[PDB]
Design a protein around this ligand. Structure first.
Ligand SMILES: Nc1ncnc2c1ncn2[C@@H]1O[C@H](COP(=O)(O)OP(=O)(O)O)[C@@H](O)[C@H]1O
Ligand SMILES: Nc1ncnc2c1ncn2[C@@H]1O[C@H](COP(=O)(O)OP(=O)(O)O)[C@@H](O)[C@H]1O
Ligand SMILES: Nc1ncnc2c1ncn2[C@@H]1O[C@H](COP(=O)(O)OP(=O)(O)O)[C@@H](O)[C@H]1O
Ligand SMILES: [Mg+2]
Ligand SMILES: [Mg+2]
Ligand SMILES: [Zn+2]
Lengths: 49, 571, 596, 619
DNA sequence: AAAAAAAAAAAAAAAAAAAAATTTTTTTTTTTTTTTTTTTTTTT
DNA sequence: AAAAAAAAAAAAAAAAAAAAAAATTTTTTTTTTTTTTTTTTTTT
């Protein structure tokens, strides 16, 4: 929320000063799967969880 | 600009190879830790490479870092034995590198900020001494343009703080892990730390809570000294400019208040923190300290101020004091070997000039006229400094061992007169004043001058100069001084002979006991003001004359010349 | 953003480049730019009167708008010196201007300076009162990454009186990937920075009024231009300082004066040299040499009648002897000191004020006007940094000059005991606990005293008529007696001359060059002075009813040498001849012998 | 915060200045610089194998960390092109560096563009999916204050990939005195900007899986180099994007591929020549110009036997006639169209696959695979602007190209009539209420129908035996009838040929595991593409003799007596047949590189039609 | 010897400066669903 | 061959996800200016 320098100048850094540096982020692969209950596992009248 | 890896390679090969291995012997001595400081010489480096020397002159601090790390890496191959670990600091560094070896895992890579730093683990220090080509510049003239530049200055000292331990690398230990983190200090202040970046802490997610202590730290001998322009350097009407100088390591405790100094260093800045910009203080970081130009028989006495004529016995007694009577502390009660002279005179015989020459001469000297130094000027007083009521000294305590050339003693303030009586009688100065409760130690010797009883009764010699107008005397003196204006021993050699002469320590013989007692009683009858003080006067003058002869035994010639001098003075 | 077009800025730089060219019209600024180039200086000085003469509307724009027009001026100077020279303009990165001349409504004092002159170029009179320790402000900061081996250089700008945000004044301490830097102090650039406090000049302020003061800011090649107690005249820009980041402003804008030029009193006018001056002084030196001193002393102070010998001695003090310094470190002073003393209404104070008006670095003082610490130096406490500090007294300010003491007899004895230092050495050994010093106060002393009993007793010896001791009269090289001789022809001529005066520059030029001149003395003169002083040092020199005035000494011989050398300086011969020696003999004889 | 020097950047720029310095070598990159300066193009394409061989380490460094490395490359390029010509190098504020070569590990597909390849120049083949409007982006914006007679130039940095600040993104509108600023659009500077979406090819992609696609931001220099449906190989910098400001972030970083260059993955625009090859073609033409058509015809489609007339006709198609657009836009087509009708197992589909593999911009259309709206173009709304866009069909894609119609008989009458205006005029005039247009598809059609009853009955007439209207058979200009005679003698012929081709192997390259003008005359048995490609351009005008002869032969064909009884026509002789005669004559002359169609080509054309059309139905 | 001027040190008060600081709501986008038209396909 | 029925396509409308957008002074500190008091040094 607040820059931590104590040396930004005679004035201070504004409120919420940080912008994410996109290039300097090291990232990974991720995947949102939609797993559905096993059809033989589902009880008779219910619906697949 | 250049590449500082190349520069470091250059200076490494240089330090290994230049000359008897001139730098090699120094390197091996510090490797064994037979010296703690080192000194580069830009004359010795201009012996081969001038570009590197000019670069050092223009950006000296960086090359200081280069040289010191280069010697740090040259260290261990020069090391040849096991040093005895003379300090608990030695114990710490040895233990530190031992555990680094223990948990080394040499293939394993460690971060750019996980390592014992040089400024901590060096245990030696490296300074410089600027080249003869580098003219010492005026303290006023060392402006912003000369910030970072290598610069030598010549100035008088005004006041010097004591040796208090500046922090160099603070060491912190943790409450859970047990590692030891460093905060390398640079500036006048540091905010302490409270959290430990040790990787065990980063793995545990524990509260750091590290506690600073002095044990594992690295302090250093630090002084802030002041310096003042030379009165000859000063321009036509301005007061002399001052300067602050910072003294580190084996540069500490060289200069002392009142002694002329030549300091070689770099003019680096500190943060000032009301106009915008980024302002900054200026301190000169000393890197070589050399006192200079004041504190580095018949023909000799005539060499004492050749520009004055006559007063040959006066000059001989002045030479005698400058040698100094033998310092004695027998059976507790002190019989000090100081010689106190007063010159009462008709108006104008160059007595002030004699005092000024003695001021220029003696290794410690303070020439004080009537009221320029009064009260605290002669005594010692209190001043704000680490801010504190630092008690520092005036003229006499500055001249604690030397010669106070007091001019116009007749018209001094009565408190000044009382203090001078105290110092001539007991070489102390007791004070119980408003904010001072002390007994200063002032082992000074007094050269009073004045114009025409207590003076006679508290001294070793009083000399009345009455220039009774004698035509031939004045003719010869007139020819002499006119020749002086017409044409306009060396001082260093004179002072060298005196300096060696100070330390022969004669002891009086038994053969002269009858002679001295007989001469004492005979002088008393010839008087009938003389007393035990005059006995001590003849006796001190005898000891000092033996010193001038350099023999360790006083003889009849010495006492004869002493009585000659005193007879001439009284008459 | 970057400006592509600006009618104001473009025409400003065009007009400036045109004005500063000046080669086709009398070469004033061509000569000045060539001079600062050769002398290696980069702050030009510009006559605003000439600027008004050439382009008056530009002048009004400059005065009524300071920062914009000055930025345009300094950049035009940059381009102009770039044209005349390449490597020099590359070496020096920004070329300042300072302003000078007559500033009609804007030539003010710190009292009359209201807010009407904000952002404008004022010319403020008045003394200096404060002088801050000179400090470097960082302007181009170089850093080196130890890990990356790359060097960067952050820059800054003179945001002294403009809007300033934290981004401009950040100073690097970390690399873009958290690899802490090492600053390269030597490779960086710096600008010294000082702040003085002008005050309205103490006489010119209306009486019974607490004085008005204005702060002044100084930068490169202006810091050590004026110490405290300087009768300065600062030309500069009057502006407002922004109270830093607010959220509530009272609207009270503090103000400063960013100095674009600094000058002292014009009297110290050593450079006033020209073809006519050298021609006329060479004529004076060559066509006549046997009566230079006589003619010059005669025309010295034309208002006061007579005093031929005393005025000759005044000229001896004014020219001075020659300071003879020795290889051993001894120093035999070259400056004469004089004590006028005489009956009331013998123009003693008028001779003093004459010296005060004419000579360079001439300081008045009256008997109990200055008491000790005023006359010699003093040692005060800073009271902010705790240290001591030296305050230069009148004598110290008068170093290499003159001090004129009026009512010297009524001056307290303590002051004379204080000046026992200066009257032979020229040095004051002031000292207190935290600071010892030895201040060059090498300056002549002219003094005026009335005798004891109010008026000189004609029928008593001078030792009884003077309330001063042998010591003090010996410290004074010269003592002079003046008595109102009431003879008829004397009263006729003195009153006639006084009424006549009731109904120079070449001298000012002559005095300082003669002071520069350093003659040397001959062996003929040497033998002559030796035997003359030997003649004097004898009871046979004096006689009954003609008592001496001062205790004759080796000081008397030495000051005879100084007198002879002074007469040589008058003659420009560089050779103290028997003429000078004889003249000094006559002078010392008349000054030292008086009848009873 | 200007950097004084960086060893990395200085080293890289020196290395690439050396790489561009090509005089001691053959001069390849110097020649590339000189030609691009002459072209006014401002991108230079550097082969990664060249970079790797000259300095493998720099190739590794660049293919691992692109943007700053290519900044070094482009600064070196600017310095180099300034040394060649400072005046031109001053012209453009930047010059750019395209890539090419064997991106060995750096060749993946959008299914396999994992999060390992960030800031690495990845190579990726795929099909476009979208084509966003190519709209300007402001780079250097100039303003004018009329109150103060002032001008300003705000400057913008292309931080499409890095962190971007509002102070950088300000567009000024008022001065310090709150005056009004008027933008100077012309004096400002802009660069085009387009987004597209590459997709994993369905021929390459996994069979049962959803598509996967990657976003590609084409700035200037690459505006219209990729439309939807095209095959394109994109090489460029996969990176991350900055989320707009806000105190919160989820970790999500929607990623793009800022393409460094994009090339046509079809690899069928291939005129790659050398001067020696040009001379080879020239001699091949001129030495034996009169027999060259038969040389080409016998040559074309090896690995098949006989059908020499059909090979001649497919040559007439591929070489093409000559389109004619007269004074008022009466556009008379210049394409051949062939209908193979014949028994099964007559290599008709093999001829189709041959022309698919050889002819540039050839595309297959099945009977009920493609259908109408797929075949010709379509009109559909956007749904992001409610505006009617046009979706180019198979034929429109095949404009100035070939379409191979498998099982033409099975296209229903709706599509068989939808092909009419493309067959004749080579255009599709489509329209719905919002938008209308005349998409241009100057296509050529080789169509392999199969006979009614599943096999030709010899005694039945061709019109009875073909299930196709005389209406369409007019529009087709040649109909070739391919019967399986079933005689043992020609069976021996075809069989020996076929089994020889079953015995032919990759020469030397294989061991036993399964997967120049003239040819080295392998007993068991490229320049075709080169020569036919150059042949297409020539416009050999008809001579007076050829025009009179072709006219009279057409009149003879129209007259019923020219066909004897017991023969049955296969296609009625409308005037389309005369235009067929002219087009086939032009195609033969183009084979000869004649520059004039002569009586030789005319009589070859008349021979072609006489064999093709009139069939001998037997009793 | 007493008076007084100056010095340093200590304290009060007014002006300027320093510092502290996430949550709720709205809008684009994507994705399906539904209606109705158009198209295609099967029947007599 | 044309009519009837069904299937698919095109286009408009709705529901949720997740990234964007907007609002937003007051109290404490502390330096500096001013005054005051006790003392020492100096003068009458
Ligand atoms: N023999 C000599 N050599 C040098 N200077 C001399 C000599 N005799 C007299 N003087 C002069 O006498 C002057 C007065 O001397 P000074 O030191 O003031 O004596 P005091 O101060 O005791 O009266 C000096 O300026 C000095 O030059
Ligand atoms: N020799 C003289 N010639 C002309 N005026 C004189 C002379 N002596 C004294 N005066 C006059 O006396 C007046 C005051 O004299 P002043 O300098 O005050 O002497 P003092 O200091 O003894 O009072 C002046 O106006 C001055 O002109
Ligand atoms: N003229 C021919 N020459 C050589 N082989 C042929 C010929 N016609 C047919 N064949 C063989 O018969 C097979 C028929 O395949 P294909 O062409 O796909 O079916 P169709 O001929 O019915 O279109 C081919 O694989 C080919 O090997
Ligand atoms: Mg003396
Ligand atoms: Mg008077
Ligand atoms: Zn820890």
């Amino acid at each position: 929320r607040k820059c931590n320098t104590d040396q930004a100048g005679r004035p201070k850094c504004p409120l919420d000063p940080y912008f994410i540096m996109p290039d300097k982020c090291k990232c990974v692969d991720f995947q949102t799967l939609k797993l559905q209950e096993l059809p033989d596992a589902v009880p008779h009248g219910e619906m697949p969880r | 600009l250049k590449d500082y890896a190349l520069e470091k390679e250059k200076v490494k090969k240089f330090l290994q190879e230049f000359y008897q291995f001139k730098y090699g012997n120094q390197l091996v001595r510090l490797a064994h830790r037979e010296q703690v400081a080192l000194y580069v010489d830009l004359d010795d480096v201009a012996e081969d490479d001038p570009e590197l020397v000019d670069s050092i002159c223009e950006n000296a601090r960086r090359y200081a870092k280069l040289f010191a790390d280069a010697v740090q890496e040259l260290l261990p191959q020069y090391k040849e034995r096991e040093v005895v670990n003379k300090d608990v600091l030695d114990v710490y560094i040895e233990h530190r590198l031992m555990m680094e070896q223990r948990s080394r895992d040499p293939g394993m890579v460690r971060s750019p900020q996980n390592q014992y730093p040089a400024e901590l683990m060096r245990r030696f220090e490296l300074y410089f001494q600027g080249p003869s080509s580098n003219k010492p510049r005026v303290i006023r003239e060392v402006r912003a343009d000369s910030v970072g530049k290598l610069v030598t200055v010549r100035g008088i000292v005004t006041r010097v703080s004591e040796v208090k331990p500046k922090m160099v690398v603070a060491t912190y230990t943790c409450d859970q892990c047990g590692a030891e983190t460093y905060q390398p200090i640079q500036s006048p202040t540091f905010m302490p730390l409270i959290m430990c970046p040790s990787q065990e802490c980063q793995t545990n997610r524990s509260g750091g809570r590290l506690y600073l202590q002095t044990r594992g730290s690295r302090f250093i001998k630090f002084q802030e000294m002041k310096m003042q322009e030379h009165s000859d350097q000063v321009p036509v009407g301005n007061i002399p400019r001052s300067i602050t100088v910072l003294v580190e390591g084996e540069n500490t405790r060289i200069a002392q208040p009142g002694d002329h100094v030549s300091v070689t260093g770099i003019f680096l800045p500190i943060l000032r923190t009301v106009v915008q910009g980024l302002l900054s203080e200026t301190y000169l970081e000393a890197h070589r300290i050399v006192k200079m130009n004041k504190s580095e028989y018949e023909k000799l006495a005539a060499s004492i101020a050749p520009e004055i004529y006559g007063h040959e016995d006066v000059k001989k007694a002045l030479l005698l004091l400058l040698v100094g009577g033998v310092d004695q502390s027998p059976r507790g009660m002190k019989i000090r070997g100081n010689i106190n002279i007063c010159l009462m005179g008709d108006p104008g015989v160059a007595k002030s000039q004699l005092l000024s020459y003695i001021d220029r001469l003696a290794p410690r000297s303070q020439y004080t006229t009537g009221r320029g130094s009064s009260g605290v000027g002669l005594t010692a007083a209190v001043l704000r400094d680490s801010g504190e009521l630092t008690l520092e000294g005036g003229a006499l305590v500055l001249a604690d061992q030397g010669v106070c050339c007091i001019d116009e003693f007749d018209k001094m303030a009565e408190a000044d007169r009382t203090a001078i009586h105290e110092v001539m009688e007991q070489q102390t100065i007791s004070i119980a004043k408003a904010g001072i409760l002390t007994t200063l130690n002032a082992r000074c010797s007094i050269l009073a001058a004045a114009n025409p009883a207590a003076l006679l009764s508290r001294f070793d010699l009083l000399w009345l100069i009455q220039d009774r107008p004698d035509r031939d005397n004045d003719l010869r003196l007139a020819q002499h001084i006119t020749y002086v204006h017409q044409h306009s021993l060396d001082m260093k050699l004179m002072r060298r002979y005196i300096a060696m002469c100070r330390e022969k320590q004669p002891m009086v013989p038994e053969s002269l006991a009858d002679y001295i007692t007989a001469a004492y009683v005979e002088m008393r009858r010839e008087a009938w003001y003389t007393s035990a003080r005059t006995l001590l006067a003849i006796l001190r003058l005898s000891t000092a004359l033996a010193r001038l002869r350099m023999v360790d035994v006083v003889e009849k010639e010495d006492v004869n010349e002493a009585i000659r001098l005193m007879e001439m003075s009284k008459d | 953003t970057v400006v592509l077009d600006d009618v104001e800025l473009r025409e400003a730089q065009r007009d400036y480049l045109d004005f500063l060219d000046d080669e086709e019209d009398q070469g004033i600024y061509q000569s000045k730019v060539r001079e600062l180039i050769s002398d290696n200086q980069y702050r030009l000085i510009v006559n605003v009167n000439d600027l008004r003469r050439k382009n008056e509307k530009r002048a009004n724009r400059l005065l009524n708008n300071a920062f914009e027009e000055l930025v345009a001026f300094q950049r035009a100077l940059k381009d102009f010196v770039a044209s005349i020279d390449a490597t020099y303009a590359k070496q020096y990165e920004e070329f300042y201007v300072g302003l000078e001349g007559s500033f009609g409504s804007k030539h003010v004092s710190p009292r009359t300076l209201t807010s009407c002159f904000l952002s404008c170029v004022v010319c403020v009179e008045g003394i200096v009162t404060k002088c801050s320790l000179v400090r470097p402000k960082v302007v181009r900061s170089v850093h080196y990454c130890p890990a990356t081996k790359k060097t960067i250089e952050r820059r800054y700008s003179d945001l002294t009186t403009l809007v300033a945000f934290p981004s401009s004044s950040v100073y690097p301490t970390k690399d873009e990937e958290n690899n802490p830097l090492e600053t390269e102090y030597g490779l960086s650039v710096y600008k010294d920075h000082q702040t003085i406090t002008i005050q309205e000049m103490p006489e010119k302020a209306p009486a019974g009024q607490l004085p008005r003061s204005v702060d002044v800011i100084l930068d490169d090649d202006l810091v050590d231009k004026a110490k405290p107690g300087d009768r300065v005249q600062v030309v500069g820009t009057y502006r407002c300082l922004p109270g830093k980041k607010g959220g509530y402003t009272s609207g009270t804008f503090r103000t400063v004066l960013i100095a674009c030029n600094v000058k002292q009193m014009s009297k110290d006018a050593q450079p006033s040299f020209s073809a006519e001056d050298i021609a006329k002084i060479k004529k004076f030196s060559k066509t006549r040499s046997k009566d230079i001193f006589d003619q010059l002393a005669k025309s010295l102070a034309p208002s006061i009648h007579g005093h031929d010998y005393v005025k000759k001695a005044i000229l001896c003090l004014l020219l001075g002897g020659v300071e003879r310094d020795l290889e051993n470190g001894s120093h035999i002073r070259g400056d004469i000191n004089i004590l006028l003393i005489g009956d009331p209404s013998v123009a003693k104070s008028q001779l003093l004020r004459y010296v005060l008006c004419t000579a360079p670095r001439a300081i008045p003082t009256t008997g109990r006007g200055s008491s000790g610490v005023g006359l010699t130096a003093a040692v005060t406490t800073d009271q902010e940094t705790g240290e001591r500090r030296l305050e230069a007294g009148a004598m110290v300010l008068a170093d290499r000059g003159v001090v004129c003491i009026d009512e010297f007899d009524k001056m307290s004895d303590m002051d004379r005991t204080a000046i026992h230092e200066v009257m032979e050495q020229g040095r004051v050994t002031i000292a207190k606990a935290g600071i010892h010093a030895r201040l060059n106060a090498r300056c002549s002393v002219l003094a005026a005293a009335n005798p004891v009993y109010g008026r000189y007793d004609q029928y008593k010896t001078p030792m009884e008529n003077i309330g001063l001791q042998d010591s003090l009269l010996s410290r004074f090289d010269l003592l002079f007696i003046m008595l109102d001789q009431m003879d008829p022809e004397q009263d006729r001529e003195i009153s006639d001359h006084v009424l006549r005066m009731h109904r120079a520059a070449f001298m000012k030029k002559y005095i300082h060059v003669a002071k520069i001149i350093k003659p040397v003395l001959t062996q003929e003169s040497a033998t002559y002075i030796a035997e003359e002083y030997s003649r004097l040092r004898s009871q046979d020199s004096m006689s009954s009813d003609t008592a001496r005035t001062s205790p004759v000494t080796a000081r008397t011989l030495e000051t005879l040498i100084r007198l002879a050398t002074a007469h040589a300086k008058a003659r420009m011969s560089k050779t103290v001849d028997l003429q000078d020696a004889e003249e000094a003999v006559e002078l010392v004889q008349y000054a030292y012998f008086k009848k009873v």
